[PDB]
Structure formats: C-alpha cells, structure tokens
Amino acid sequence: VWRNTEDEILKAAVMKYGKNQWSRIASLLHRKSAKQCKARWYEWLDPSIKKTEWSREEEEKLLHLAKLMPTQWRTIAPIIGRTAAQCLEHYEFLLDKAAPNPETKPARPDPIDMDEDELEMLSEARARLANTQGKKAKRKAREKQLEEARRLAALQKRRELRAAGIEIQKK
Amino acid sequence: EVVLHEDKKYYPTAEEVYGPEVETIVQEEDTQPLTEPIIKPVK
Amino acid sequence: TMPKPQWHPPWKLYRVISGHLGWVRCIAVEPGNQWFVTGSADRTIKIWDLASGKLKLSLTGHISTVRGVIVSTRSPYLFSCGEDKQVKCWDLEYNKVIRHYHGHLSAVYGLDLHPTIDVLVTCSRDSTARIWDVRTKASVHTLSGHTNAVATVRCQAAEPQIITGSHDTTIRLWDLVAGKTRVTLTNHKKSVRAVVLHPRHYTFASGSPDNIKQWKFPDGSFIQNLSGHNAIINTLTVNSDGVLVSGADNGTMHLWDWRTGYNFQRVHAAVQPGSLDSESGIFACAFDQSESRLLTAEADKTIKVYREDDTATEETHPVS
Amino acid sequence: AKTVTKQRVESHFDLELRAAVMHDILDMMPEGIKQNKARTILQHLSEAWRCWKANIPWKVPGLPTPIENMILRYVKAKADWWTNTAHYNRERIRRGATVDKTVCKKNLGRLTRLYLKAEQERQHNYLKDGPYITAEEAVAVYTTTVHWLESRRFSPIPFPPLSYKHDTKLLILALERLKEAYSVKSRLNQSQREELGLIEQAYDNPHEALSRIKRHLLTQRAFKEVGIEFMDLYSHLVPVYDVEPLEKITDAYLDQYLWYEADKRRLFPPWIKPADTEPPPLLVYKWCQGINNLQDVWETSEGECNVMLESRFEKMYEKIDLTLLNRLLRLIVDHNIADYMTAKNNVVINYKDMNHTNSYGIIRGLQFASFIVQYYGLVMDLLVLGLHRASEMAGPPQMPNDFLSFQDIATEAAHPIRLFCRYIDRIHIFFRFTADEARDLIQRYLTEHPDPNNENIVGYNNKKCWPRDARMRLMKHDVNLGRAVFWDIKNRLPRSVTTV
Amino acid sequence: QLSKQYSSRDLPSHTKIKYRQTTQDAPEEVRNRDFRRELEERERAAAREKNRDR
Amino acid sequence: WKIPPCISNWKNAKGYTIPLDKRLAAVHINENFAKLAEALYI
Amino acid sequence: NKAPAEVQITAEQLLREAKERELELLPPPPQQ
C-alpha cells in the first residue's frame, strides 16, 4: 500500500529528477520498485488527473462510449479525460444506481508518531534532493580545502624553517 | 469507403505537386554495371 | 539609374530526378557534356545521363557526406571531397579510387582544380586551404589566415589565382606561388558561402545573406551590389550570356542579369511528395556546357533541371 | 590528423552535424543580436532528436519559426542516416557477414524502436479512420458463426463454478507450466523472484489463490502495463511480451480451464491442427496417407486435375477487432470471461521509454492467446469452406469424424475441396476437379482477369530444389488452373479481416 | 625542421598523370564542339526511344 | 527572437528542481464506430 | 501508537528542508 509520506517523496522526486528516470526515484523509496512508482504516478499523483464530480455531459459521453467500445477502458479513458480506474468505478456505479491494486486508492495518512524508518527516509530523501553535486568534483572541492591547509601549513613552517636559520630549497 | 491502413494515401502524388507537363524520373538501382568504364580507353 | 538591362528569356522546370537517399550537396558536368555527377549525404556518388536523366552508375567509397565533386578537363579523373576529412581521385577508366590526399584536420567543404597546371585546392573547416600536387599527393602549400571555416574556394589561371570565402565573413585573394594573401575583402556582414568568376570579364561575384556583391580583379575593387535575395545563399552560377543564378537555402532561386544587376525571375519550386516544407533548399547549381540547361541539387533529395523558355518575348515578359 | 575509421563514425557524425547547425542559422539567420544563444538551440536540437526516437510530438511554446524549421530539417537528416544504417546492418546480419557483438545489440535496439513507431501510428490510424470492417462483413461473420455453433449443438462454457471438482488440477497444471520457465534457477532478477514467491505461496495454500482468481475474473477490467522486447533470430525478430505475475497466474488458470472445457464440449473440429493427438511428422504422414486414400485420386483419363494450395492468412493476429472479438467470444463463454479476455488485450505496451495503447490487434504474449487465435481461425475456416462443406467434413455432431475421413464416399466426392488442414495460421487445401468444373473456373477467372499475352506462366513460383524432371511443368492450362483456384479462394475473405 | 619519419602510404605510387587522349575528350575537341545542337539531338533521340517504350 | 530554455525529461545535468507544471509542457474518434456497434447489437 | 497525524509532511516542506540543508555552499576561502 501507499503512505502519504511516500507519495509526497514521489512528488518531489519527480519534480527534481524528471518524468523518465523511474529507477532513481524507486531508489529514493524503501520497499518500492520502479514499476509501482511509475504506476502510482500515472494513475493518481499526476497533476493532470481530475478527481472531481462527473459533469452531466461527462456521464452521457461515458455511457455513450462504453456502448461503442465495450471493455476497452484504456481506449475510452483519454477520450473523456480521466483514468481508466475512475471510468470503470463510475460506470459500474451509474449502472447500479439505475439498477487488489493499491495504486488507485488514496494514501493512508501520517500517524501521530511516525515509525522510525518513516522518519529516516525523510531525512535521507532530504539528503538526496539537497545535493545537486557529483562525486569526483566534490572530491576536488574537499582537496581544494586540503590544499589550502597544505600551502598554509608549508608557508608558516617554511617561514619558521628559514626563520630558524636554514634556507632549504625544495628544488 | 473505408481505406484499410494498408493504403492510407498521405502525400499527393508527383504529377499533382509538379504539374501535367513536368517529367518525373525515379531512378533506384542503376544500369551499366561497375566494371564498365565511364571513359573508355583506346586500343 | 542604369541603361536598361538586356532581355533574357525566363526558365522553366522540365525534369525532376529522384534517386538519392540524402541531401544532394554537389553537382558537376563532364567536359564533353554527356553526363553529370552528383554527390550526396548518403555517401554515394551517382553518375547520370544528361540527355535522358537515366542513372548510369553509383560509386560508393566515402564514409560520410560528399560535399564536392569535380571532373578534370585534362585527365580522366574525378576528384571528390567528403566530410570524413578525405579527398579522393577516381580514375574513370576503371571506376576506382587511385589516389587520396591526406592532411586536413576536419571536414572538407569544397574543392577546385587548376585549369592549366595540375594542382588541387581544397578548403576545409579547420580554416585552411591546401594546394595539393595532383600527381604526388603532396601538400605544397597550406593557405592559412582565415579565422573560421573556409566555406568556398575557386581558382583561376590569371592572377590572383585563388579566391576563398569563409564563415568569418571575409574573402581573400591569394597568390598560388608565394602562398599568402594579397587582398582581404570585409564588406560582407555574414558568412560568404558562394563565390563565382565571370567567364569572360575579369570580374567576380560573392554571395551572402546580406546581398551579392560584385568585385573587379586583380585587387578586388568594389563594383556594385545585387540586393533582394534575403536568404542564406548557397550557390552562385553565371552563364556566358550574363545570366546569374542565385540559389538560396530555403529553396527560392533568383535569376539576375549580371551586368546591370536586375533580378529578372524568381523561382520558388515545390517539394517532392513525401517532404516537409521545412526541407526545401538548394545546395548546388550548375549550367550545362552548352549553357542551355540549369541543373540544381536540392535538400529534398531531387535534381531539378530547368531549360530556357523559347516562346516568350520582350512584350510578353517586359523588363521593369 | 587521424582518419575517421569505424569506431569514430558516430561521434564524428555528431561533431559535423552540430558544427553545421552552428554555422547554419545561429550565425547566418540571427538578429537575436545580444547573444544569439546558439549553445541553447543546440540543446533543443538534441532534445528534438531524443523526442523523435521516443515517438513524442515535440512542440516548444514560443520559438521563432526559422529555428523550428532548421531543427526539423536537421532531425530529418539524422533520422535518414540512422535508419539507413539500420537497413544496411540488418542485411549484413541476416546473410551472415558480421559477428561483431555490439552491432547485433545496437541493431536489435534500432529495429525495436522502428517497430514501435510504426505500431503507434497504426493504432492511431485505427482510432481515426474507424473500424476497417464494415457493418455488413461483421454481421455476416457473426451470423455465420451463430449458424455453425447452433448446428453443432454446442453447449456454451459456464463461469467456473464454486465447488468445481477439478479446480486444483487445473491450478496445479497452470503453476507447473509457469515454473517451467525458471527451471535453470538462474541469476534471475527481482521480478522473477517475486513471481516465484507468488507461485510457491499459491502451491502451498491453493484456496486463497483460487478465491483471488475467480474474484479477478469476475470484477477486473483494467490491467497493468505490458512490456515488449524482441528476440533476435537473425533472419527475423520475434516479439516477446512481459506480463505481471498476479495476472499471469489468473491467465494461466483461465487458459487451462478454457482449453479443458473446449475439448470436452468439442468446440474445435478435427482440422484445426496443432492438436494433442500427433506430432507434426505424424501430421505429414497422415496428410500424405489421406491424399493417397481418396477415391480414384491418381486417375487422369477423363482429364481430372488435382490442385494442392497452401498459404497463410498473412496477418490474423494483427487485424483482430476487439469489439467484434468481444461479441464473437460471448457466443462461446460467459459474458464475464469474454469481457475479461477482451478487456485484457487492451493494455499499455511499454519499451524503454515509448508507451502506447493496444486498441486494435491481439497481444500474443497472453496465456489464453492460443484460444483466441484458434477460435478466430475457426471462424475463418468457416468463411473459406462454407457451412455445408464444413458440416460434411466435421461429420454429424453425434458421430464426429476423424482428422481426414468422411462418413461415406458419396459425401466425400460431392465437392472439389477434399482435404483441409489449418495449422495455427497456415492453410493447406486439396481440391480434385473434373474437366468441366476446371474449365468453368478458368473461364470465370479469365473473364475478370484476362491475360491475352500469356504472361500467367511468369509470376508462377516453383520449388527450385527438386530437379526439373520433378518440378512443375508450366502448361497454360495448368498455370491458369493454379491462378484460377487461388483467385477463387482469396475472394472469400474480406480484406479488412485477413488476406492471402 | 624536416622529419625523417615516413609512412607506408607515402611511398611513390601512381607516379604518372594520365592525360585525356585524342578520342576520350581532349580540350581541343571540346574547344571545337557545338554542344547545344548535339544535346537537342540526343534529347530527341531519347524521347523517340522511350515513346517506342510506349 | 528570444529562445526559450530547454528542460529535458532525460538530462538534468546540474540537478535542478522544476515545478511539475513547467516540467510537463515543452483524440479523434470516427463516427462509424457507432454504426458498427449498433448493427452488432441489433 | 498508529493514529492520524496533525498537519502533514507535504512535499514543499521537503524541498525547503533540503534547500535549507545548505551546507554544500560551505565556508569562504579564509582571508589572510
């Protein structure tokens, strides 16, 4: 199942990495694979998916289509602009008023005390999102700090060495 | 009057884009095999 | 104003050849006028008959776009030049490469042949030209001095013997023996991709998106402008009767009068069926040897042949 | 100044292409004076190319037209280069010239992308130019099938009952078949690990499994997305479909149940022949042996003529229409299972980063696809033979016939079609004509396709493997009879359903 | 500053230039010829042959 | 002549956050489906 | 104790936490 913490990580992860690097994002999350993340995005968390009430024109067109092209909900869904799970639930519901897969369901909210792992993930998600920088390049930056200590140490020690009275030449 | 995707004519044909009198050659693979010199030598 | 321009008849398209699988980038006619040769961005060199338009033969040696071909008037040789930095000499009694000129450091954009001595000149994107010895494949001079790709080169027997136009918007007139630039012409504001020499007048013209300009040898004294064609101009080609063809890169082609600079026709041809309309463009044009036909090599993989119109008169098509 | 060899062909193509682009407009159609941003137009160029490759419609909100035309022109340049290289390498791989192992993988990836681009275009054209099957071909098909099933006294398949006796046997068979993939117990992956987990826990607790299965078959009609990839057989490729585990189990059980019941109620008449009764070499033997046991078959006195035709339905898996298929399945099974089966072929197909929706054909990587293919082929056997001759061949429903036998000799000789075999989508027919039936056929053929210039002898294709003393001898009566027979058969099939 | 290095491909090869012989197309003949009329001749011939085609 | 910047869905070289909306932006049905489906029901 | 939390852990909060984790800017090269 899907927990509000996780899909709130997923919104940010998609916001940062892009809409095509599902394995990276899947790595941000514990206990999720890239297939499930992609499914959850394309079924519920996409901002272009409508969760509203069916306008009367929507419902008439839905029944119209469901008669023109029966059981083809992936074909029908974009013709009216909602996901196939919504169209399927609402169509059966219309038929009965006149008579799993957890991607689709909403997210269980956050508890009062978040289980420890729920918390460390957030910190580490915060960790990953914060750092734009690479590894090699970061090593060079740390080395640059190291190098100013080197020159800085050498000079004072060189000053002191030549101050002690010995005029060393490196070469 | 349904056109099987096997036909699906895009792309107006050449005579319609160029005109009734402009000639139109389409030359895929050539005549005159490669061994035949373009400039023939003397003998 | 001007005296009034000579009346030239207008030209009409009468043939459309299509067998290439990439843009057609260069075109040339044999000395004896029986066949012409096209080089394309599908790395072949096709040889077509000029009467029938039939394809005679297909030569495949290059590794990338063939950007120039030429046929030598003194020897049975065809010299081709590609984007693979290689320059080739095909012997046309066996149809096989016999000689290759090595040393350019990036794609070779064009090439011309000296009419009396046996040398080659090639221009490339490393912003140099080279004078090759046809017979020993040795580079006898590296004409350097431009500061950007060298779009075009033309060579002549008179003096100065080499004119290069480059993408830093400059023209240079070089001497062949000394190997250095005599004159530098900086009148154009945009890349000079086209240069042509009048057959019988010791003058030349140079094309750029600003306007075509005319210059007068041997030290390049300005003469006049030719304006109106606002397009990246890929070619210029002059007839012996003073017709000057200016082929652009969006497909449009203007025909001018050389002497007074009066644009007497504007052709806007149509793209081959399966083409986009963003893919109309002229890369090379060449007059026949009789100077009756005008062949053009286009960015929709066709070769269009124009012939002069014989049933028009000064009063049917007056000169403004 | 090192040459451009074979490892630097691609990197060099891109060097020179983007040098050209930078020359081209970003310095010769400017007047974005300040700083003409050419380093960013090159970014647009690379992204337009990736969008071409992914089959995405690329349109940037406010971008001057000259630039957009420049980019479209150059992406068409690179696309021509890319696919011409694919054509060339594919011919080398097919005939056998290169063994390089990076070219094999590069080329399989190129042709996978080319196939999926053509395929998304074919589905869009379906949904735009509408069902290719008119409402009068489809009604003839539907009514002919109802007449068949009614004359046979078929007994439709019911939804698998609650206390079915065989549910555990059908489930054990499904799960054993699914295990058979990972016999090796290889390095597999996460997803096969997960499938093995599901299979084992269903092998331990077989009633939560079956409860789930029937709940699915009853209520589910929108499924997850399928993966596709290609198996490279060096002379053609094969598509390989990748479905998710929960549904693979539900489909495997549905498959077993349908084939079991179909075989008990006798849905498929004896000519639909990848059958469980003999291996293919025994089919060849029974065919040779049935031809020979026809009555007076080798006699040529009165000018009789035997014709053996063999063909292929040329794409039946690809022009199935899911609406018509729904209605044709409903005649056979419960509407619940019919709706499951036809709502399951309509899924999203995904390769690396290309995605589309199946709406027209059939996904053969499903587990009941055998049943759909053979039932649809049954409908087409009926269109080709006619209900009367199909009822002669299949015998009366109380006393069905064997593979290639008839009830008596009277019926067998009452018609030219003496034998008929249909492998999955392959057709073999054997006719025996008398001289008048043959002459009549040839007349009606020549009336409509008149060949006065005697080139019918030319298109005819023979088998250049036996010596000429054993090949076919092309006399005009003979090749004309061949063309007439073929012309007559390919006229019984609407071209919007299947062809030949 | 001339090197003594050397190359397998800089050995002498094709050391004589072929010149275009008397019949092939020497600059003398093409200096002579009348091209427009010859071209229209072969053009008419080709149209004749291809109407014989059909 | 101003050139919009590219935000790709594949390359994020410098690791920059872009809101979902701007990240995002950068069908026909014939009328014979009705005649076919209703002919089948009848 | 599992029980519905009070406010939530919506994304913008994460992006702000990461942006404020601003330690990779680091300290300036020391003036001497």
> In terms of CA atoms, which chain A residue is nearest residue G17?
A126
Taking one residue from A and the other from G, the number of pairs with CB-CB distance under 8 angstroms is 60
- Give the pair of three-digit tokens for residue C46: 């096709």
Which chain B residues touch E53 with a CB distance below 8 Å? Answer: none
Residue pair D482/D429 in contact (Cβ under 8 Å)? The answer is no
Give bridge partners of residue C49 from the DSSP assignment: C35
The structure was resolved experimentally with cryo-EM
Interface B–C counts its CB contacts (< 8 A) at 75
Helix (H) / strand (E) containing D320: none
Considering only the beta carbons, identify the residue of A8, A126, A127 that sits closest to G10: A8
Distance CA(C20)–CA(B29), nearest Å, equals 10
CA-closest candidate to residue D366, choices D351, D339, D344: D344
User: Any bridge partners for residue C306, and if so which?
Assistant: C13, C294
Contact assignment for D135 to F8 by CB distance below 8 Å: no
**Distance (Å, whole) CA C287 – CA C63:** 28
CB contact under 8 A, A15 and F18: yes
Residue of B16, B39, B40 to mutate for C, most C C-beta atoms under 10 A: B39
Distance between CA atoms of C226 and C238, rounded to whole angstroms?
Answer: 14
Q: Which of D233, D239, D242 is nearest to D118 (CA)?
A: D239
How many angstroms separate the CA atoms of D168 and D146, rounded?
33
- Cα pseudo-dihedral C134, C135, C139, C140, rounded to 10: -90
Contact across the interface for C273 and B14, Cβ inside 8 Å: yes
What residues have CB less than 8 Å from D280, skipping those under 6 apart?
Answer: none
Report which residue type is found at C271. V
**Which residues in chain D touch residue A73, judged by CB atoms under 8 angstroms apart?**
221-222, 343, 346
What CA–CA distance (Å, rounded) separates D374 from D329? 12
> D138 — phi, psi (to 5°)?
-70, -35
How many degrees, rounded to 5, is the angle at CA A110 between CA A105 and CA A114? 135
**Residue D430, exposed/middle/buried by CB under 10 A (0-12, 13-18, 19+)?**
buried
Q: Kindly report the CA angle at D449 between D377 and D463, in degrees rounded to 5?
A: 60
Nearest CA in chain G to A115: G2
Question: What are C233's strand-pairing partners?
Answer: C248
Q: What are phi and psi of C171, to 5 degrees?
A: -115, 145
Structure tokens at A128: 């990953």
| CB contact residues (below 8 A), chain C span 122-151, against chain D | 125, 149
Among chain B residues, the shortest Cα distance to C95 is held by B37
Rounded CA-CA distance C28/C77 in Å is: 13
Token duo for residue A115: 């289980």
Burial of residue D281, with CB atoms counted within 10 A of its CB: 0-12 exposed, 13-18 middle, 19 or more buried = exposed
Half-sphere exposure of D396 (CA within 13 A, CB side): 5
Identify the residue whose tokens are 């909060």. Answer: G13
Neighbours of chain D (3+ CB pairs under 8 A): A, B, C, F
**DSSP character string of D404-473:** T--SSHHHHTSSSEEEEEEETTEEEEEEEE-HHHHHHHHHHHHHHS--SS--HHHH----TTS-TTTS--
CB contact under 8 A, D322 and A74: no
E15 touching chain C per CB within 8 A: yes
CA dist D89 to C44, D98, D100, D229, Å? 17, 9, 11, 19
Chains A, D: CB pairs < 8 Å: 46
Structure tokens at D184: 């090796």
Structure-token match 């394995």, residue found? A23
Query: Are the C-beta atoms of residues C13 and C282 closer than 8 Å to each other?
Result: no
Give the whole-angstrom CA distance, residue A138 versus residue A148.
16
CA separation, residue C312 to residues C260, C262, C320, E43, E50 (Å): 21, 18, 16, 22, 28
Cβ contact E27:C74 at 8 Å: yes
F7 contact partners, CB below 8 Å, separation of at least 6: F18, F22, F23, F26
Contact with chain E for residue B38, Cβ under 8 A: no
Are D27 and D67 in contact, with CB atoms under 8 Å apart?
Answer: no
Q: How far is A94 from chain D (nearest CA, A)?
A: 16
Q: Would you list the DSSP string of A75-113? A: HHHHHHTS-HHHHHHHHHHHHHHT----SSS--B--BSS
Sorted by sequence, the CB contacts under 8 Å of residue C83 that are 6+ apart come out as C64, C65, C66, C67, C107, C108, D16
Cα nearest neighbour of B39 on chain E = E24
Residue type, D484: A
Who's near E34: CB < 8 A, 6+ residues apart?
A: none
What is the C-alpha to C-alpha distance for residues D2 and C104, in angstroms, rounded to an integer?
9
Q: Which long-range contacts (CB under 8 A, 24 or more apart) does G26-30 make?
A: G26/A141, G29/A148, G30/A148
Whether residue C237 contacts residue C204, with contact meaning beta carbons closer than 8 Å, is answered with no
Contact between C71 and C113 under an 8 Å Cβ cutoff? The reply is: no
G14: closest chain A residue by CA? A126
For this entry, resolution in Å reads 3.3
Strands (E), D27-179: none
Query: How many whole angstroms separate alpha carbon D299 and alpha carbon A26?
Result: 74
Pairing of strands D237-242, D226-232: antiparallel
By Cβ distance, the residue of D4, D28, D69 closest to C278 is D69
Partner E contacted by B39 (CB < 8 A) = yes
| Nearest C-alpha neighbor of C283 from the set C236, C223, C220, C224 | C236
Length of chain A: 171
- With beta carbons under 8 A apart, name residues in chain A contacting D190: 33
Q: Which residues of F touch A66 (CB under 8 A)?
A: none
The 10 Å CB-count burial string (b at 16+, else e) for A105-125 is eebeebeeebeeebeebbeeb
- Round to whole Å and give the CA distance between C64 and C57: 19
d(CA F26, CA F3): 13
Angle at G9 between CA G3 and CA G13, to 5 degrees: 160
B contact set with D (CB within 8 A)? 2-6, 8
Q: In sequence order, what are the residues at sequence separation of 6 or more whose Cβ sits closer than 8 angstroms to the Cβ of residue A158? A: A168
Angle at the Cα of C213 (from C208 to C218), degrees rounded to 5?
120
Question: Coil, strand, or helix at residue B24?
Answer: coil
What are C49's two structure tokens?
Answer: 């008959």
In terms of CA atoms, which chain B residue is nearest residue E25? Answer: B39
Binary contact (F15, A79; C-beta < 8 A): no
Instruction: Identify whether the C-beta of residue A2 lies closer than 8 Å to the C-beta of residue A107.
Output: yes
Which of C64, C87, C109, C282 has the highest number of chain D CBs within 10 A, making it the mutation to test binding with D?
C64
What chains are in contact with F, requiring at least 3 Cβ pairs below 8 Å?
A, D
Take residue D233 and report the two structure tokens written for it. 């057989």
Instruction: Look up residue E41 and give its two tokens.
Output: 């001749």
Asked if residue D57 has a cis previous peptide bond (ω within 30° of 0), the answer is no
The structure tokens listed for C160 are 């100065």
| Pairing of the two strands C194-197 and C11-18 | unpaired
Hey, is D311 helix, strand or coil? strand
Distance CA A3, CA A29 (A): 11
Q: Which amino acid is at A34?
A: A
Chain F positions contacting chain D at CB under 8 Å are 1-6, 8, 10, 25-33, 35-37, 39-40
Determine the 3-state secondary structure of D312 from DSSP: strand
CA distances from D311 to D424, D426, D493 (A): 12, 6, 13
Round to whole Å and give the CA distance between A32 and A125.
Answer: 14
Q: Return left, alpha or beta for C216; rule: phi > 0 is left, psi -120 to 50 is alpha, else beta.
A: beta
Quote the minimal CA–CA distance from C32 to chain B in Å: 11
Tell me how close the Cα of A170 comes to any Cα of chain G, in angstroms.
24
> Which is it for strands D426-433 and D305-312: parallel, antiparallel or unpaired?
antiparallel
D118 interface with F at CB cutoff 8 Å: no
Q: How many CB atoms lie within 10 A of CB D181?
A: 12
Which pairs from D390-397 meet CB under 8 Å and 24+ separation? D390/D148, D390/D269, D391/D151, D393/D269, D393/D270, D393/D271, D393/D420, D394/D152, D394/D269, D394/D270, D394/D271, D397/D151, D397/D152, D397/D153, D397/D266
CB-nearest to A131 from G3, G24, G32 is G24
CB-CB under 8 Å, B17 with C56: no
- By the 8 A CB rule, do B19 and C16 touch? no
How would you list the strands of the sheet with D305-312, edge to edge?
A: D305-312, D426-433, D417-423
Q: Is the CB of B5 less than 8 angstroms away from the CB of D496?
A: no
Q: Which helix (H) or strand (E) holds D237?
A: strand D237-242
For every residue of chain C, which 3-state class applies, written as one string? CCCCCCCCCCEEEEEEEECCCCCEEEEEECCCCCEEEEEECCCCEEEEECCCCCEEEEECCCCCCEEEEEECCCCCEEEEEECCCCEEEEECCCCEEEEEECCCCCCEEEEEECCCCCEEEEEECCCEEEEEECCCCCEEEEEECCCCCCCEEEECCCCCCEEEECCCCCEEEEECCCCEEEEEECCCCCCCCEEEECCCCCEEEEECCCCEEEEECCCCEEEEEECCCCCCEEEEEECCCCEEEEEECCCEEEEEECCCCCEEEEEECCCCCCCCCCCCCEEEEEECCCCCEEEEEECCCCEEEEEECCCCCCCCCCCC
G14, G24, G32 member nearest A9 (Cβ): G14
- Report the alpha-carbon distance of residue A123 to residue D317 in Å, rounded: 52
DSSP-derived letter for residue D238 is E
CB contact under 8 A, B2 and D132: yes
How far apart CA A33 and CA D126 sit, in angstroms, is 34
For chain B, how many helices (H) and strands (E)? 1, 1
CB-CB neighbours of C251 under 10 Å: 22
Cβ–Cβ gap C52/E46 under 8 Å: yes
- DSSP for A20-38 reads S-HHHHHHHSTT--HHHHH
- SS3 category, D244: coil
The CA–CA distances, whole Å, from C190 to A54, B43, C209, C210 equal 60, 54, 6, 7
Q: Residue D165 is encoded by which pair of tokens? A: 């006796």
Do A and C touch (≥3 CB pairs < 8 Å)?
A: no
Distance (Å, whole) CA C263 – CA C56: 36
Residues of chain E found within 8 Å of residue B42, distances taken between Cβ atoms:
21-24
Cα separation of D311 and D299, whole Å? Answer: 26
The pair of structure tokens assigned to D280 is 């293919």
Q: Which helix (H) or strand (E) holds F23?
A: helix F20-24
D-chain CB neighbours of C65 within 8 Å are 16
Chain E residues whose CB is inside 8 A of the B21 CB are: none
Type of residue numbered D202: A
CB contact under 8 A, D134 and B5: no
Closest to B30 (Cβ–Cβ): which among C16, C53, C55?
C55
* N- to C-terminal Cα separation, chain B: 66
Assigned token pair, D141: 């098909």
Q: What DSSP designation does D164 have?
A: -
**Using the beta-carbon criterion (under 8 Å), do C276 and D23 form an inter-chain contact?**
no
Q: How many residues does chain B have?
A: 43
Report which secondary-structure segment, H or E, holds D30: none
Residue D88 has phi, psi (to 5 degrees) of: -60, -55
Q: What are the strands of the beta sheet with D237-242, ordered from one edge? A: D237-242, D226-232, D348-351, D354-357
Both tokens of D53, joined, read 């490759």
Preceding omega of G27 cis (within 30 degrees of 0): no
Q: Any chain E CB within 8 A of the CB of C73?
A: yes
CA distance A88 to A96: 12
Question: HSE-up of D379 (CA within 13 Å, CB side)?
Answer: 28
Give the amino acid at F10. W
Strand C243-248 and strand C252-257: the pairing is: antiparallel
Contact check, Cβ <8 Å, C64/D68: no
The distance from CA C42 to its chain's CA centroid, rounded to whole angstroms, is 19
* Helical pair D167-179 and D245-265, crossing angle rounded to 10 deg: 130
Helix A116-130 × helix A4-17 angle, to 10°: 10
Question: Chain B within 8 Å of E24 (Cβ-Cβ)?
Answer: yes
Task: Name the closest residue on chain B to residue E22, using Cα atoms.
Answer: B42
- For residue A50, give the amino acid letter: K
* Structural Rg of chain D based on CA atoms: 29
Compute how many other C-beta atoms are within 10 angstroms of the C-beta atom of residue C236: 23
